[PDB]
């Protein structure tokens, strides 16, 4: 034996560390701002009603558990493309796109990364925003690509470094790959405004870059599925053939069921079929065929008028609670007599927020108030409730005054 | 655009070809022996009662859809290792194994291949039997390992080439990797007998090879969970610390739910934690966390005595039906006046059977008898029913007489 004597202990995960330290707390006033999933007003996981209805429908039909085609459930992939591109999209209607079911957003990004490693002969470089979701790195690196970065978040104003971004992208070598978060940037919450997006499209177009969109929060960010997909749809309409990863983790609350899709925009239907064949050849030896449950659920909801309708109400409800907590946090901090500028908290979008707090403050926050978050000043707004937002604002004031 | 113009349409699957032809056929006597999933006596997909019961249970408990840890559902991984190693296994009891949930057997095989690519510094060569499941090649190849082969199947007798296997294995450089099918070899159905396995184990031990067991049919092969895992358990007992992939696709009919696990036998519990940390680092950037449905069902079955008990009867029924068909096929070939030796048919184990039929004979069976199979003489015993076994016997007789 002794095959593994040299395998060393891997680095501990921080996020993991806060949660655990959180559990190990007695203060009934403790807050976990490191939670990576949506939580209702009571701090409880939320299974959507439309989701429970879908499950009841599936159960009633006594469906089989036979393997899905390599590319997944057809009703799912098509519905997925339609949600993303829009019903009257030319890309959709002409069938010049190919969508394959992936294991949620992450599996989709990986299949996508592996596809580029294999067929994107023009470059090996993937440009990520500074900063980006932690997983983005190992995803591409493990896939065999080289990581690069473009300026994005401005720590001075806790907002978008629009000028740095524009300057960086303008200098990116032609035919390089650039990853863009479609909405609700993770981890900052900083997104470009419609007008800045128009401008990015143009440079991306001019530099002839391959735009890789990561769309994990459609509908969940603003409560509007069309508005959340505006940027993606704009690029395509501008003639930029992007590639895209979708997740239904947050927007349908399908977390553990793992429903997602990877999409490639092609020149035509014929090209789309060649691409599809190669995507299937790549996935087979990865995991053979995808998990059916989440896809069956998502497909029902998307394809059933009544359920789809209930879904939009529920997603909006989620988006709204988030926006509400953002609004209430700022109002409360003001009322506390805090003199700092906290408008970034409300200018931010989605579940994650870069507060600007410093490490020593985060620490004070953790030590004296039982408020757990990562040292980067990033908080999950999902961890804030109507009942604790007050306590949170209070604490933040104390540590920052 | 114009990014994918150089992407060529990938080669088509021959098995797909067989299925499509089968579907097009109008002869009500048509048989599909290219089928890769179990079918009941009526030729229909079979969801086990214990599976329906486990599902109803989940529903009843109104469980959340929260993300599972990277390594998967703890109850599932533990029960999984226990199923494989046996409750009284020293390996199990001492906790010197690490099991992680994978996307069925395939994902589990890939995670394993990627793990070795990364940490198995001793070699890059993976020796597969001739032949092996088609997907084994690209799995290992895509992971970055080099493929080798060792003699296994003897076309002369439609059985094990013990001499060739033994001769090949004896010349494998120390510390190389060898892939072994635990039971129900895919695609021949030819498995070593106990005495043969004892000799194989001795050489594997002596040459200090890392044994990688692919266990995709535990309990489904012979109807006995213990007997199916005999060889695996024997290697471990002899002091060979193997790596193993388990699938619940067949044994539990979980096909599309994708429940599987990857296991590493370690020196001690200490070493196991380190390896486990490295597996987590590998998986995160692959798909982040595993699909929960299949694991939940599997865990419930294994962990609930009432259900586990019912599962064993059910898996036994599946196994018995297949054996039954093998028996009946041989008997009818005699009854038809077949002068040939059809023993291999009853000697073989599991869903696949290498008949020995030649390419031209297969053609006739297809062309004249509407019996669909691949040109390799391989048949899926699942496609055979009490109602058509007689016809098959008839047809085989006609084309080989
Ligand atoms: C930007 C980003 N992309 C990818 C994902 C992956 O999500 P999942 O794999 O859980 O679907 C997420 C996590 N919600 C994300 O925030
Ligand atoms: C030998 C072998 N190993 C791996 C697998 C993959 O099974 P799955 O991915 O469907 O669980 C199978 C298919 N049952 C198999 O025959």
């Amino acid at each position: 034996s002794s095959w593994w004597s040299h395998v060393e202990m891997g680095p501990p995960d921080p996020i993991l560390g806060v949660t655990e330290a959180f559990k190990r707390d007695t203060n009934s006033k403790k807050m976990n701002l490191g939670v990576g999933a949506y939580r209702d007003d009571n701090g409880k996981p939320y299974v959507l009603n439309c989701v429970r209805k879908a499950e009841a429908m599936i159960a009633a039909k006594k469906m089989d558990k036979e393997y899905l085609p390599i590319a997944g459930l057809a009703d799912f992939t098509r519905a997925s493309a339609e949600l993303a591109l829009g019903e009257n999209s030319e890309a959709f209607k002409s069938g010049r796109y190919v969508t394959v079911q992936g294991i949620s957003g992450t599996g989709s990004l990986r299949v996508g990364a592996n596809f580029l490693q294999r067929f994107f002969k023009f470059s090996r470089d993937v440009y990520l925003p500074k900063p980006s979701w932690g997983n983005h790195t190992p995803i591409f690196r493990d896939a065999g690509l080289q990581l690069q970065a473009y300026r994005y978040y401005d720590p001075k104003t806790c907002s978008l470094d629009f000028t740095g971004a524009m300057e960086d992208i303008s200098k990116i070598p032609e035919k390089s790959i650039i990853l863009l978060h479609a909405c609700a940037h993770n981890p900052t919450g900083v997104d470009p405004r419609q007008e800045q997006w128009k401008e990015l499209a143009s440079v991306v177009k001019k530099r002839n870059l391959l735009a890789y969109f990561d769309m994990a929060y459609q509908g969940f960010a603003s409560g509007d599925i069309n508005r959340d997909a505006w940027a993606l749809r704009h690029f395509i309409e501008q003639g930029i053939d992007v590639v895209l990863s979708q997740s239904y983790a947050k927007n349908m609350g399908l977390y553990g069921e793992r429903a997602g899709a990877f999409t490639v925009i092609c020149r035509d239907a014929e090209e789309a079929k060649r691409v599809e064949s190669q995507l299937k050849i790549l996935i087979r030896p990865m995991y053979s065929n995808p998990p059916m449950n989440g896809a069956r659920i998502a497909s029902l909801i998307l394809n059933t008028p009544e359920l789809r309708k209930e879904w939009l109400v529920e997603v909006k409800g989620m988006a709204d609670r988030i926006i509400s907590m953002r609004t209430q946090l700022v109002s409360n901090l003001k009322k506390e007599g805090s003199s700092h500028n906290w408008q970034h908290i409300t200018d931010q979008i989605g579940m994650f927020c870069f507060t600007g707090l410093k490490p020593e403050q985060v620490e004070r926050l953790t030590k004296e108030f039982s408020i757990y978050m990562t040292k980067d000043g990033r908080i999950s707004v999902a961890g804030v409730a109507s009942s604790n937002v007050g306590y949170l604002a209070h604490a933040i004031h104390q540590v920052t005054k």
Side-chain angles (χ1 to χ4, degrees), chain A residues 67 287-289:
Chain A
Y67 290 129
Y287 55 83
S288 191
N289 50 68

Side-chain angles (χ1 to χ4, degrees), chain A residues 88-103:
Chain A
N88 328 296
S89 178
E90 161 276 321
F92 180 71
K93 319 282 253 199
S94 63
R96 86 208 177 63
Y97 76 84
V98 52
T99 302
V100 301
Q101 174 174 342
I103 301 164

Side-chain angles (χ1 to χ4, degrees), chain A residues 76-373:
Chain A
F76 170 82
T77 65
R78 196 209 44 232
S80 207
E82 172 197 298
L83 174 60
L85 301 183
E87 324 208 338
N88 328 296
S89 178
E90 161 276 321
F92 180 71
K93 319 282 253 199
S94 63
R96 86 208 177 63
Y97 76 84
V98 52
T99 302
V100 301
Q101 174 174 342
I103 301 164
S104 221
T106 311
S108 301
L109 283 163
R110 183 62 183 268
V111 158
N114 282 20
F115 176 81
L116 303 175
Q117 180 279 344
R118 184 171 289 180
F119 300 103
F120 199 70
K121 58 182 197 184
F122 326 93
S123 174
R124 310 282 62 186
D125 305 311
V126 181
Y127 281 83
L128 300 183
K130 317 206 302 183
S132 200
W133 176 45
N135 215 29
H136 282 143
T137 300
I139 290 181
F140 293 104
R141 187 194 283 135
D142 280 2
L145 306 165
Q146 305 307 294
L147 277 326
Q148 311 270 12
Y150 58 90
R151 280 163 297 164
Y152 188 85
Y153 177 75
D154 191 342
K156 74 184 194 255
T157 76
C158 299
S159 69
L160 185 65
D161 181 6
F162 185 71
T163 296
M166 293 292 284
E167 265 186 30
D168 279 0
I169 298 169
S170 289
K171 279 148 162 142
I172 291 184
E174 297 199 71
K175 294 169 185 296
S176 275
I177 302 149
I178 187 183
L179 182 126
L180 294 157
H181 297 231
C183 61
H185 180 267
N186 179 353
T188 80
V190 171
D191 282 357
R193 296 198 332 265
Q194 138 169 0
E195 18 307 331
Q196 303 171 302
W197 268 125
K198 284 180 188 207
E199 288 188 59
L200 287 162
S202 86
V203 177
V204 164
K205 194 169 181 189
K206 229 188 163 206
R207 309 285 304 162
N208 189 47
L209 307 178
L210 171 91
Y212 194 160
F213 276 88
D214 181 355
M215 180 157 78
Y217 304 101
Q218 178 185 20
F220 181 93
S222 74
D224 187 321
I225 66 164
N226 292 300
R227 183 191 120 59
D228 293 351
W230 191 88
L232 164 72
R233 291 177 189 180
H234 178 84
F235 274 53
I236 291 160
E237 165 188 293
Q238 295 297 309
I240 300 169
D241 286 347
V242 307
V243 308
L244 152 88
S245 166
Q246 283 171 89
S247 174
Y248 293 86
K250 273 75 184 192
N251 79 351
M252 291 187 174
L254 292 186
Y255 300 101
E257 304 279 357
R258 332 288 296 132
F262 176 63
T263 296
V264 182
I265 303 294
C266 300
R267 165 141 163 171
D268 59 45
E270 198 281 310
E271 169 159 290
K273 239 73 193 38
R274 291 193 266 104
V275 170
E276 184 182 36
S277 81
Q278 290 303 336
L279 278 169
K280 276 144 83 161
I281 282 158
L282 178 72
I283 287 163
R284 217 204 141 127
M286 280 183 77
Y287 55 83
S288 191
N289 50 68
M292 81 202 325
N293 209 55
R296 279 182 163 168
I297 295 162
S299 167
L300 263 184
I301 296 162
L302 300 166
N303 292 312
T304 317
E306 191 59 60
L307 285 181
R308 181 185 182 100
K309 192 150 243 181
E310 176 167 22
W311 175 51
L312 297 175
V313 166
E314 302 185 83
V315 79
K316 199 186 151 36
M318 293 197 291
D320 290 353
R321 198 186 82 72
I322 299 298
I323 280 169
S324 178
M325 298 294 104
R326 271 180 193 285
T327 293
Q328 304 175 223
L329 167 65
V330 169
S331 146
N332 290 308
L333 268 157
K334 272 172 63 146
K335 160 215 221 85
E336 280 284 314
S338 166
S339 80
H340 294 293
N341 188 352
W342 294 106
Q343 92 139 158
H344 49 109
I345 292 186
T346 37
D347 286 341
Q348 287 166 4
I349 282 149
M351 105 172 329
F352 303 111
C353 167
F354 252 38
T355 65
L357 286 173
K358 294 167 203 174
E360 34 272 297
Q361 337 209 254
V362 166
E363 273 173 335
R364 277 202 68 194
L365 263 187
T366 318
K367 271 47 186 91
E368 329 190 6
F369 301 89
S370 281
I371 296 161
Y372 298 98
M373 55 178 272

